[PDB]
Design a protein around this nucleic acid. Structure first.
Ligand SMILES: O=C(O)CCC(=O)C(=O)O
Ligand SMILES: [Mn+2]
Length: 202
DNA sequence: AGGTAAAACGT
DNA sequence: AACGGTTTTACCT
């Protein structure tokens, strides 16, 4: 059984590419550091984030925004690593989205207990473009629902190297990550990373 | 009028 | 601890 209409999980798709992806996460973070963003309501997110590529997802007092500039450093986000772009392209093609051209990569870091409450990815103007989501390190429970918040949830363990792609009919589906369980991974030591690729511009 | 804020406590 | 209330409102454009 596939995940949803226009959605698929590619298990261990990024396993072989993982070590290089993690080196490149470190390189990106050396320029635009991980930070826990503050919601408009004034709460600090448990997930630490940074971005690469032309546009980066951020919180602001007025809401959420994709920006070409890191508001912390006041410099552009680091360029999207070739390893990121190549993996994303291969995953998108395998998932049935061969024309996907991302211009934005959000890098999430989960410490033990870190979560991402059920939400939609909707800050992007071109809804024809899919989401490519790459898991690295410690395993996490991914929630995948429907168009409405109360739509029944699928719960899927996402392990190191797993790639999830959604778009088309499932593009605006609610999804999230349950509080991360503590553990060890030889490549990340004590955390989970996630790479979320999007077309956020035109 | 529609979009977005909640990507964030009680049972 | 899975589910759902809150946005059951307050501001922008
Ligand atoms: O960490 C994940 O697997 C999901 C991340 C996510 O939903 C997001 O960054 O919008
Ligand atoms: Mn998301």
């Amino acid at each position: 059984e596939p995940l949803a209409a226009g959605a698929v999980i590619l298990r261990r798709f990024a396993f072989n590419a993982a070590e290089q992806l993690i080196r490149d996460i470190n390189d990106v973070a050396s320029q635009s550091p991980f930070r826990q963003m503050v919601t408009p309501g004034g709460y600090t997110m448990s997930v630490a984030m940074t971005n690469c590529g032309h546009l980066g997802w951020t919180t602001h007092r007025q809401g959420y925004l994709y920006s070409p500039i890191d508001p912390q450093t006041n410099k552009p986000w680091p360029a999207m690593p070739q390893s990121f772009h190549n993996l994303c392209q291969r995953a998108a093609t395998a998932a049935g989205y061969p024309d996907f051209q991302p211009d934005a990569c959000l890098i999430n870091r989960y410490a033990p207990g870190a979560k991402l409450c059920l939400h939609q990815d909707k800050d992007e103007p071109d809804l024809r473009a899919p989401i490519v989501s790459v898991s690295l390190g410690l395993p996490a429970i991914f929630q995948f629902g429907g168009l409405k918040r109360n739509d029944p949830l699928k719960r899927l363990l996402l392990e190191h190297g797993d790639v999830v792609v959604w778009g088309g009919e499932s593009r605006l589906f609610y999804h999230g990550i349950q509080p991360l369980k503590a553990g060890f991974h030889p490549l990340t030591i004590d955390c989970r990373y996630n790479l979320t690729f999007r077309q956020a511009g035109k």
